[PDB]
Amino acid sequence: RAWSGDSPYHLNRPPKNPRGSKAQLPDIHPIKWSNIPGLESVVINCFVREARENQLLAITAALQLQQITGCKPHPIFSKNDVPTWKLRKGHQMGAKVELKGKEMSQFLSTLTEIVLPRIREYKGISNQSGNRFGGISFGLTAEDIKFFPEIDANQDSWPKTFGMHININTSAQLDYQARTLLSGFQFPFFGEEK
């Protein structure tokens, strides 16, 4: 917001914060032939909290990501010092990976076609999930990770497996458009929508 110029002290005064937020928010344009929603990236987050005591679990998690996805994993390092959780700073706690194009297409296809159907009690993705400007996030557990072809093929080499969050970033202006797009890609939704 801008200060009304009714007082001289408003001449060089920095502008005010947005009414409800400390951060500015984007504008929403009508959907037209040039701005249809679509998938732009997928990011997988694997933070093994039990790696606080054992650094090798980070390497195992990176290998899990590499085998599932096929891209180069990138390490995750601790940033905060929380005693109650016994989390120090500067240690390797896991791995991440970002997917685009054919590789993310394959990852989503295999998820929907193989892994999600093999979950015990799976209703879909919560309809009240995702950042308010396009993007849907949902998680997977270790037993769920065991369903991927690479792990099932060589169970022997996987005494322990780790869960991970999955963040799908799309071009949707708002979240419900992204939900429709993912439903088109066959991603079930169960909860009540906002």
């Binding site: 009304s4 110029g5 009714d6 007082s7 408003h10 001449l11």
Partner: protein
């Protein structure tokens, strides 16, 4: 409700200072904003203490509690710290210890202001008078139709203050820095800045 006991993280001793004399005609705090009757200083600017303000507060509350949806607003906060020293002490040896909170009340400011469905001007007047008898200055009653005291013997009306934009005045009498910014946004400078 901490008007008589600010919650400063680091409690610090403060210098004596002086009660401001608003020679620029400042009317900040000298208008009715929350209620319908009010109490305002009339004598020279003075200093009020938390104990005196609390005594005035309960004096007014004795009249405000027996009312239908009656409210009292406290326009003043004791945001200055004061120190005391024992009488059996030589001058010097640094400052003393914290004694009490205090507020500097200029001539025209409004201390309390009340409203109520069953309120009546005479009742408000007696309440405010009794409350004023417990403060170290001279005080008077203010209503919504009353002028704003800008001095000991001078009043004024807020409607006389002209409303004016200042962006336009700045534009019409620019500053050297403003002209520099404007001349920096010209293409022959922007296109050659080199950064």
């Amino acid at each position: 409700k901490h008007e008589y006991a600010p919650r400063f993280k680091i409690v610090q001793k403060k210098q004596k200072g002086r009660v401001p004399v608003r020679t620029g005609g400042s009317i900040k705090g000298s208008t009715l904003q929350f209620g319908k009757y009010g109490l305002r200083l009339k004598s020279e600017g003075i200093r009020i203490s938390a104990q005196q303000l609390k005594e005035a507060d309960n004096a007014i509350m004795r009249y405000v509690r027996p009312l239908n949806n009656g409210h009292l607003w406290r326009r003043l906060c004791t945001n200055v710290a004061v120190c005391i020293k024992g009488n059996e002490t030589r001058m010097g040896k640094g400052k003393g210890g914290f004694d009490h909170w205090m507020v500097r009340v200029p001539t025209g400011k409004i201390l309390f202001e009340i409203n109520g469905d069953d309120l009546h001007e005479k009742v408000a007047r007696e309440a405010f008078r009794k409350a004023g008898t417990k403060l170290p200055g001279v005080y008077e009653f203010v209503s919504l139709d009353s002028l704003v005291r800008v001095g000991l013997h001078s009043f004024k009306n807020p409607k006389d203050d002209p409303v004016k934009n200042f962006y336009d005045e700045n534009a019409k009498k620019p500053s050297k820095k403003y002209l520099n910014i404007l001349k920096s946004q010209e293409p022959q400078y922007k296109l050659f800045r080199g950064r």
